[PDB]
Amino acid sequence: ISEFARTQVTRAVSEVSALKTAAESAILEGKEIVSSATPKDTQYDIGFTESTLLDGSGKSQIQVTDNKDGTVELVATLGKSSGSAIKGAVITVSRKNDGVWNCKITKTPTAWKPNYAPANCPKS
Length: 124
What we know:
Blueprint: H1 5-17, H2 20-29, E1 33-34, E2 44-45, E3 63-66, E4 72-77, E5 90-95, E6 101-106
Parallel strand pairs: 1-2
Antiparallel strand pairs: 3-4, 4-5, 5-6
């Protein structure tokens, strides 16, 4: 892979962020949000495919926290084809109960550089 590290981080943020639509649909339907190949009963799977930039396999690349209170976290870790200077960093795309979302990056590796974070998902 020849993409820039910052392009990889941004793509990953976009891949997680693309799932907000589905999370909003689950919330309107009164269903628990999941990312699973085996959603149980009333659970609503958010339709994620797979990324070349995230650790884990398929739907398990996105870790969902659904507190059932209008807040949501969609969490992924940079891995696989990601450059060594970003691997292990965690993207968290979070919803407040007013329906406003935000993004942050945490747990970055030593070799992280400021310019790798996009303006829409700052390092915390």
